[PDB]
Structure formats: structure tokens, C-alpha cells
Amino acid sequence: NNLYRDLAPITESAWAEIELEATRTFKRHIAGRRVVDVSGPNGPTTASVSTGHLLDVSPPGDGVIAHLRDAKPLVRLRVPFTVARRDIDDVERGSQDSDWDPVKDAAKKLAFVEDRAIFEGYAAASIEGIRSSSSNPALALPDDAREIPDVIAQALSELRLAGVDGPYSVLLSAETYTKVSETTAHGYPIREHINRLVDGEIIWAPAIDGAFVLSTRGGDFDLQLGTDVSIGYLSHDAEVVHLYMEETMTFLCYTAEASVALTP
Amino acid sequence: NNLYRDLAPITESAWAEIELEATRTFKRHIAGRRVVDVSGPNGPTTASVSTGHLLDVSPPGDGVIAHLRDAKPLVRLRVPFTVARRDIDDVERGSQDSDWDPVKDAAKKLAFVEDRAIFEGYAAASIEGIRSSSSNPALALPDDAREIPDVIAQALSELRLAGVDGPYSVLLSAETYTKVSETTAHGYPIREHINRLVDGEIIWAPAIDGAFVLSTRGGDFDLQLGTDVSIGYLSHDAEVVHLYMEETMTFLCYTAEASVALTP
Amino acid sequence: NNLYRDLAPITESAWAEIELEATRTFKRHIAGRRVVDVSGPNGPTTASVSTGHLLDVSPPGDGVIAHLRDAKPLVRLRVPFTVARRDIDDVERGSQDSDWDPVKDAAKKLAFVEDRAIFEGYAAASIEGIRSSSSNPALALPDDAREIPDVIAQALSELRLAGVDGPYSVLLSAETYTKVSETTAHGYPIREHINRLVDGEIIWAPAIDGAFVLSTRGGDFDLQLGTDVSIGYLSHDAEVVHLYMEETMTFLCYTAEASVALTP
């Protein structure tokens, strides 16, 4: 295939180690996939997602009405990294302390870009994020950690006024999650205080900035994937090999009233 | 379905008559479908055709390479017409001279727009025609009808220099076909003179202007259809019913050297 | 094998596309293979073709008669070309307008060299062409296109005086074939005028210069192949891949009276 892995100077065991390390880190650092419906890979031939809408266009001639079908293009994200042939070779010698830090960093970068496109928007890819697409009024996250549950209750009140149902979930930023975790009250963390309110789960969202309270009934958010995360090979040298992590995706929000955003 | 035919004041017999009359006229007046590969209807959900190419785009952030997948949108052509309820009603009385001239005119219009988009281009739909996409030099159709075969032989020489194979076919305009038909030499029409050269067929192309000599080996032209020609209903009155003929399509040319264009 | 295709950064689909495109163009531009017997590939170990003749040589010593066996060596023709990794990669994305023009040009070049060696001679390879090996007197192709059939009839008279039988065939140059095709008489091309005389076929020979009338009974011309046309890999870069088209061949003419040559 287009990955050209058979041409890389890497053994099966080292390939397995790299894949495992990247998968673990990405699954750690990814959050949107846990609260958004995912349309499984449709193949490399997939390039756009139809919206079912029509756009006006100049007719070819008299007596003819012309309309253009509307589609959302898919964007390919590629993050390159470099690995050492010595660490690669040591694996077949029964070594199991090899350095895969570039792999972990690339996985973190890819997860962050994906989550930031989902929750904030990537305009050049025509991706409007949940924050912008949300219709319910946005709130402000208090500087202190003790007042956050009140704001979350207000956001639940807003959604739950608007008429959305299903389990509710709170996605918190790295800085906010650290705050609610370190901070404590009556012998419990402010994070447990927050958890007490919702029916769903509390989720880490390091890539995003602020906080988000959203419904998970289904049918409101769609992450379309052409091809899932993959690892490939570009070139190599006497000392290093250059690889990349690739994924082709787009994001769509259909219900603007199923989420509430809180800004720092 | 979206046609809403069940709501129209028309009987099954009249529906059949209208469908038959439109199909006959369209199949008469259509030419590109006889020399271009047709990708059958893929359903109303189809909105674009992937090209497999990539487009450069600003990255979300540092260390990330971003590319956009390239697709060709589909365009919907709708031609409205009006029919008389008296002619509709007469059918169930065993009448078989009913007037379907508006149906025939609408079918002609739709065929003409389709063929003109295929052979000349519809820019607003991002459709580049065979004439523009052709790489072989264009020729001029002589005013006289006696020199046309020489120009056709020159065009065959150009294609057949360029290295294309398979049966060759000549599509002639209405004005040019009338000329070669009426004109005669040695007791045979100039059209038969033309036919003597090629291995394929001589085709009517009223919508196009000029003439075209092209190969039919396959894999060079693709007419993508989302939905084929259909007839629908908009509204009705005590005297008339308003209908439309609809089709969603796009056209792609892959080989620029498989055709030669001759301009009036 | 020596092609080293497994080392090239090309997918199976792109390999198939390149092979198909090269085969089509070569089969289009090749002519000698249609009128000469072909000895199928005998393997890479084949290096020469015995003639069964003997050559005089100085003896090792007294009372000894020494002779050397005579053989015709085989010559390997290699034509390099370059391909773009972007066009290669687009194929797996369902792209089918990729550029293979260098492939087509290399195939044309190889076909032209093969046909020119067959019909004109490649001295350094000890290949004497049909033109030189022919014993029947050579003719001159008239500048005008109207007198060519008379010269072809004269050439048939010469062969057919000399006593050769079997279907006869005319191989025409690019410039001569264009002339006889464009030129017309009594509503038929001069090429059809020519075809009327012979029992065999009229053949395109762009590589050759002039015209040739020859018999196809069999046993007079032999194209010996060690290995048929093949495509290989030399090296690659971040943007391009360097490939070559290779064939090992030689040509032998046994009957000097089975052909007649016409010079421009």
C-alpha cells in the first residue's frame, strides 16, 4: 500500500512495539471519540461527505433551473517523526527499554489537532467547531475552583431548558482538570463535587481550552473518517528512519442546542 | 419519494404515455451517452466524485502537514413544463392523439443542456468540456461540404499519431449533418463519404457546435449520474398541471489526447 | 529477479496501470511483429543464435583442419524514464487520470528502435535489415500520392516474378500513410485504392522510412527474443522513481527475394 512499510529497515517486533506505543498514547490523549458518533473508515476513495443541501448556480440556458449539491471535504493530517536504527535493532536482541518518545510526541500532537478541530474549529478545512456551532449562551469559567460546579449546574439548566435529553458529560481542559483535582473540599476533590451532578462521565480534554457540557443521546455530532490513524515510511539513513502518523477526517455538528461551552 | 407523483391528478395510463414520449425523444436527441462511459446512478445521497488528488492547506499548528481531498460536485438540472388536464383525462376514454409537445420540448432541452455540458463545458459546475480539455490541436470545419472528409482524415492522423487506439467515432452538429446529408457526390452523400473512413459510427450531435472525432476504447470519458432522468410534480390547477424533468450529473475527461475538435 | 521491482515505492495497482499503458502503446506502434515470425523468449541465459555455417581458422598444428561455428549475438535495448511519486500515490485514492506520458514515450522509443533495426539494420549489432538484404531491385516512392498504387503493382510483379507465394502485405511509413489517407479519389482514399490490390493487410510502420511490400508465407524473417519487453527499477527519490523498459533481441533474414523496398 501507500505506506511503503515493506521498504523500511524495521523488524516485525519493532513495528509492533511502535504501533502499541502510539495507540496507547493516542487513546490516552483523545477525548472527542468518547462523546461523538464515529462513522467508521469508508476507504481511501472517500473524499467528501454529502450534506443533502442545494446551492443556487447560474443556469446553462433558458428554461433551466440549476442547483449544486453540497459536500464537506475531508482533510488529511500528517505528523512526521524520526526514529533511531539502534533502538530499532536492539529489540531483536530482547531489549525492552527502547526509546519511543518521538512516537509518543507525534501521537500526542495528532490527538491534540483532532480534538482541537472537533471542539474549536479548523476553518481552512471548512470545519466549524462545537463552540461556534453551539446556540446556547456561553459561560465563563470562574478563576477560583470552588464556583465551577455552580456554572456547570447553570449549563445543565440551559441544555435541559432547551429540551435535550440523554446522559450528560463534562469535558474539562488540562488546566481546569488539574485545578479541580488538586483543590479539595470537605475531604473530597472539587472534581468529585462536579461528578456528583451529571449522569455520564468526566473526561480529560487537554487539547481544548475551557470546559464543555454536552449530551450523549446520539445523532448530534459526527466524526467522519476516511482512513483511521496509520503509520508510514518516507525515507531512511544509516542512523535514522523518518516515519509519519496520518489520518483523514472531518467533523460535523447537527444539533446546536446539545452543548454548552465555558470559556477560561 | 420527493417526486410527489401520488398527489398529481394523472392516471397510470397518462403517466405511462408521458414517460414513453419523454424517453423516446431524449434517447433520440442524446449523443454523449453513446460515446462516453456511464457510471450508473449511485443514489440521491451521492453529491460529489473523488478525484484522488490533494490540495495544499494551512496547517492547524506546528509540526503538522495538512492536505485537502479533491472532489467534483454534482449539478442538478430541472426543466419545468405544463400539461393540460383535458389531454390527461382523454386518455382513459381510449384517446391516443393527446398532445405531449411540452413534454417533448422539455426532453429536448434537457438533452441539449447535458450534451452541451459534456462537449463544451459548464463552468459554474466546474465542468471542463472535451473541447477545452483536448490537447490535440483543433481544426476548422470548411464552409463547403466537399472538404470535410479531408479534415476528418487529418484529425484521425492527429489522434493516431498521438497513439490512441480503439474504434473511432465522428459526432456531427445539426447544421453540419444536414449539410453532409443534403450534399451528394458520385451518387452518394458526403455523409457516406465520411462514414467510409472510420471504423465506428456517425452520430448526431445537435446540441454541440462543430464536429468531434474521438476514440471509444474506454476509460477516457466518464458521465457520473447521481439520479437518472426523472419526472416530477410541483402543483396543479383546474386546467393544468406543472411538472419537471430532473437529472443530477457531472462529467469528467481523463485522457486529453483521445479527441479532436473541429470548430465552425 | 534482476528487475528489483520489490524495492520500488510503487503499489500493485500503479504497477498494473503502468504495464497496461506501456503494452497498449507498444502494440500500437509496433509493426514488424505482425509480418515476421517470432521465436519466443528462450530465457536470460540465451546470448546468441547459431547459423549453422563454418568459418576458416588457423589450425592448432599439422594435419588438423579447424573451423569456427558462426553465431549472431543478441543485443539488449534499455530505455530509461522517470515517474512521479504523486501520480503513483494518487492511484490508491481511486484516481484514474494519472499521467503516464513518459511511459508512453519510452514505449514508442523502444518500438521505433526495434522496427528500425528490423527494417533498416543496426550494424554494430551485426543486424542486416530487410532493405539491405533484399535482392529484388528497389523502387522510388512518387512524390504524388496518385501514382503509389502503380509502384506497388510493379513491386508485386517483381516478387511474383521471382517466384514467392503466400499472402502479400504492404507496410507504409507515417508520412506515406498520412498522404494516402488524406488524399482521396472517386470518393475513396488512395489507401483503399492500395488495399484493393493485395490479399493481406495494410500496416502502419512509423519507424521505417518509405514503404515495403513483402510475403508472409513464413520462414523468411525471424525475430529472435531472449527476453520480451520488461519494466524495471534503478533508483528513486523523495519525488520521482527511475525505471527502464528492456528487451533483448536480434533479427535474421533468410530469403532475400521475399520483399521489395520503396525509398522516399
Numbering used by the authors:
A (entry chain A), B (entry chain K), C (entry chain OA): 2 to 265
Copied sentences from the primary study:
An alternative, promising approach involves protein capsids, such as encapsulins, which can be viewed as genetically encoded enzyme encapsulation, and is particularly suitable for immobilization or within physiological conditions. The capsids, comprised of 60–240 subunits arranged in an icosahedral structure, engage with a conserved C-terminal encapsulin localization sequence (ELS), or a more extended N-terminal encapsulation-mediating domain, found on the guest protein. Our study showcases the encapsulation of the nitroreductase NfsB, which we produced as a fused dimer, within encapsulins.
To investigate the assembly of the Enc{tdNfsB} construct in detail, we performed single-particle cryo-EM analysis of the purified capsids. The overall resolution of the encapsulin icosahedral shell was determined to be 2.22 Å based on the gold standard Fourier Shell Correlation (FSC) 0.143 threshold (ESI†). To resolve this, the pentameric subunit was examined by 3-D classification and resulting volumes were refined using local refinement without symmetry constraints. This isolation a series of volumes that could be categorized as open, closed or uninterpretable. The open and closed particles were pooled and refined to yield complete, unambiguous maps (ESI†). The primary drive of this is a shift in the pore forming loop (measuring 3.84 Å between the displaced His188 alpha carbon, see attached movies M1 and M2). The underlying cause of this movement is unclear and may represent an equilibrium of states when resting at cellular pH or could be a result of different packing states within the particles stacks.
